[PDB]
């Protein structure tokens, strides 16, 4: 019936609240969706959101963060910050009075005022790689698509190694993957050469730990006539949904969180911090397992936004949705 008042620290601010988002990747589909979610949520709240991508170059990541600190942004969001530098970088953000939330970032210890956010990487693995195990009855020659050194990657690899220990008839032939400006093409080329080393019958499945990798493997399977190999992925994007619907498509499952929600929630967290509202030390997003047959059953293409119509509760959460967000949205549009 009545309107929740805008918190004073937002109401009294000189000009727009300004947020910097620095993500340690290039323009892959996951990234593209994450940035879209931060931007949309910030726009809802009347915030200026400035976004920066390092292309995976940790030096450029650091320079971007350091410049945002010097510019005195009201808040900062980091994504995919690595060791060794991310902890001291975040400590410097906090020391400068800048509100901060991080996603998939390496943080040692407890930094007061920080929220650290992540997906349930063990569950992403158990559901995706575990489907592979179930489908092959514990016996398969696989390729893994994976890159070292990122927090989600190291947690997925630990969960994966536990499943290999449980199922000794799963043989990892090779692991492939790098971050570059063309992950799809690079992966596709690399998978093409692995396909040449292990002809038809010698590979059963591929586990892709990031859908940028799986997209490239998919292209390689199609172009090389190797669609007898089945694909199991983490992440989702509009492209992946189309690929699961193509003729002869080997893309069996994606286990995923909507990256737009991840972006939005990190914004919500920074908004609460600027407002002076309690926020937790940690927060974990929950994923859904998306089977190919679901998508094949639809009457035409489905985008990620559309998944809510066929996956109850997809991409939605009330977590950190303060009642004054509605007020701000009205005060802006
Ligand atoms: C090279 Se890090 C790529 C991963 O970051 C996020 O956790 C997404 O799930 C994507 O798989």
Is residue 44 within 8 Å of 99, Cβ to Cβ? no
CB-based burial label for 205 (10 Å; 0-12, 13-18, 19+): buried
- For residue 21, CA distances in Å to 55, 103, 315 come to 14, 11, 21
Determine the Cα–Cα distance for residues 333 and 331; give it in Å rounded to an integer.
6
Is residue 44 within 8 Å of 19, Cβ to Cβ? no
Q: What is the DSSP string of 258-292?
A: -HHHHHHHHHHHHHHHHHT----SEEEE--EEEEH
Determine the Cα–Cα distance for residues 235 and 248; give it in Å rounded to an integer.
21
Per DSSP, 120 falls in state -
Q: What is the DSSP string of 160-220?
A: HHHHHHH-TTEEEEEEE----S-HHHHHHHHHHHHHHHS-TTS--EEEESSHHHHHHHHHH
Per DSSP, 115 falls in state E
Determine the Cα–Cα distance for residues 21 and 48; give it in Å rounded to an integer.
11
Q: How far is CA 183 from the centre of its chain?
A: 15
How far apart are the CA of 254 and the centre of ligand 1, in A? Answer: 13
Q: Residues near 221 by Cβ (< 8 Å), separated by ≥ 6?
A: 191, 195, 206, 227, 229, 231, 250
- Cross-sheet strand order for the sheet of 251-256: 170-176, 140-145, 205-208, 230-234, 251-256, 288-291
DSSP-based three-state secondary structure for 324? helix
How far apart are the CA of 74 and the centre of ligand 1, in A? Answer: 26
**Residue of the CA atom closest to atom 5 of ligand 1:** 152
- For residue 226, CA distances in Å to 130, 200, 201, 240, 296 come to 22, 7, 10, 18, 20
End-to-end CA distance of the chain, in Å? 19
**Residue of the CA atom closest to atom 10 of ligand 1:** 210
Q: Which two tokens stand for residue 116?
A: 């650290």
Strand partners, 141: 171
Q: Which two tokens stand for residue 233?
A: 């992925």
Determine the Cα–Cα distance for residues 308 and 35; give it in Å rounded to an integer.
20
How far apart are the CA of 271 and the centre of ligand 1, in A? Answer: 24
* Ligand 1 pocket by Cβ (under 6 Å): 30, 80, 104, 119, 147, 150, 152-153, 179, 210, 234-235
Q: How far is CA 161 from the centre of its chain?
A: 21
CB-based burial label for 99 (10 Å; 0-12, 13-18, 19+): buried
Determine the Cα–Cα distance for residues 332 and 327; give it in Å rounded to an integer.
9
Between the CA atoms of 72, 73, 78 and 81, what dihedral angle is there, to the nearest 10 degrees?
Answer: -20
Resolution for the entry shown, Å:
1.3
For ligand 1, what atom is nearest to the CA of residue 235? 9
Q: What sections of 46-181 are H helices per DSSP?
A: 58-70, 86-95, 121-135, 151-166
How far apart are the CA of 41 and the centre of ligand 1, in A? Answer: 21
Determine the Cα–Cα distance for residues 45 and 65; give it in Å rounded to an integer.
23
**Residue of the CA atom closest to atom 9 of ligand 1:** 235
**Residue of the CA atom closest to atom 7 of ligand 1:** 152
Q: In the PDB record, what is the listed experimental method?
A: X-ray
Determine the Cα–Cα distance for residues 86 and 58; give it in Å rounded to an integer.
10
**Residue of the CA atom closest to atom 2 of ligand 1:** 150
For ligand 1, what atom is nearest to the CA of residue 25? 1
Select from 144, 149, 150 the residue to mutate for testing ligand 1; criterion: most ligand atoms less than 8 Å from CB: 150
Determine the Cα–Cα distance for residues 227 and 208; give it in Å rounded to an integer.
15
Closest CA to 21 of 75, 59, 62, 57: 75
**Residue of the CA atom closest to atom 6 of ligand 1:** 152
Q: Residues near 333 by Cβ (< 8 Å), separated by ≥ 6?
A: none
């Amino acid at each position: 019936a009545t309107v929740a008042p805008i918190p004073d620290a937002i109401a009294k601010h000189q000009g727009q609240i300004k947020i910097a988002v620095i993500r340690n990747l290039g323009s892959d589909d996951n990234t593209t969706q994450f940035l879209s979610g931060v931007l949309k949520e910030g726009k809802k709240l009347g915030f200026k959101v400035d976004t920066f991508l390092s292309n995976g170059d940790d030096a450029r990541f650091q320079d971007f963060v350091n410049q945002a600190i010097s510019q005195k942004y009201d808040g900062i969001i980091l994504s995919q910050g690595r060791d060794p530098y991310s902890t001291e970088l975040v400590k410097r953000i906090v020391a400068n009075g800048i509100a901060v939330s991080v996603f998939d970032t390496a943080i040692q210890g407890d930094i007061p005022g920080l929220t650290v956010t992540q997906q349930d990487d063990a569950s992403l693995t158990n559901e995706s790689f575990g489907q592979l195990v179930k489908d092959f009855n514990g016996k398969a020659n696989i390729i893994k698509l994976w890159v070292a050194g990122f927090p989600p990657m190291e947690r997925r690899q630990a969960a994966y190694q536990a499943l290999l220990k449980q199922n000794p008839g799963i043989t990892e032939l090779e692991s492939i993957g790098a971050v570059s400006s063309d992950v799809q093409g690079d992966t596709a080329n690399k998978v093409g050469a692995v396909l040449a080393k292990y002809p038809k019958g010698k590979i059963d499945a591929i586990w892709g730990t990031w859908d940028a990798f799986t997209q490239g493997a998919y292209k390689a399977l199609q172009e090389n006539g190797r669609t007898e190999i089945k694909l199991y992925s983490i992440d989702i994007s509009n492209q992946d949904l189309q690929l699961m619907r193509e003729a002869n498509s080997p893309w069996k499952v994606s286990v995923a969180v909507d990256p737009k929600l991840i972006g939005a929630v990190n914004l919500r967290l920074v908004a609460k911090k600027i407002a002076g509202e309690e926020t937790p030390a940690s927060y974990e997003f929950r994923a859904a397992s998306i089977p190919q047959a679901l998508l094949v059953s639809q009457p035409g293409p489905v985008n990620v936004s559309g998944l809510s119509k066929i996956i109850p509760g997809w991409g939605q959460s009330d977590d950190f949705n303060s009642p004054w967000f509605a007020t701000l949205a009205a005060k802006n549009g």
